[PDB]
Amino acid sequence: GTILLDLAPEDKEYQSVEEEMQSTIREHRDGGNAGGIFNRYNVIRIQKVVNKKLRERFCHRQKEVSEENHNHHNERMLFHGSPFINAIIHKGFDERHAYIGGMFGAGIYFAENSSKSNQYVYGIGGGTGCPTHKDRSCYICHRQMLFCRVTLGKSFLQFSTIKMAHAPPGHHSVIGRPYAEYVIYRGEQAYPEYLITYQIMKPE
């Protein structure tokens, strides 16, 4: 079963995670359509996800990757957002929920910019926004996103939309440029380390 560890605001770990989240906000091409208009989040809590089986499978895959990547995990901390957070923290990332016709195929997608991940909290293109107000820029409803350990191993660099089912032979991830999108094709190559609960904040 999943255990959530509550990080304290005065912990350096809490602070480093919020700072990564706050400092990687950027302007988006869609003018804020999907994720809303904001310059900063209000972080309500940050929780560390602890789950024995998810950790086991992550370690297990880590090893296989390292062997095919000159003994390097090539791990990176990256943001992920999607409507499936609650399932992810209990069951792990599941590539079976990926979509053909994703920009780089049926993978699980991660970003360096927290604001990119925030676009997907309510679905592709922000869906119809929060359940309560149908507002993709809702400043009331709480949102969650993940700050994850991602086993990239040997990344394939892609520069056009390609519909991949799996990383290319000898590879373990795809870094795609339509800003970079980090894509894995196996759920066990990501661990949902930090669960961040937050609101976007209305600019003054």
Ligand SMILES: O=C(CCc1ccccc1)N(Cc1nc2ccccc2c(=O)[nH]1)Cc1cccs1
């Ligand atoms: O991840 C997917 C693919 C579908 C999916 C989602 C969760 C688990 C497994 C598959 N996403 C979300 C996502 N996409 C990104 C694209 C570029 C950069 C960052 C991100 C991001 O943070 N989230 C697509 C989605 C499809 C349906 C609902 S969200």
Ligand SMILES: [Zn+2]
């Ligand atoms: Zn709302």
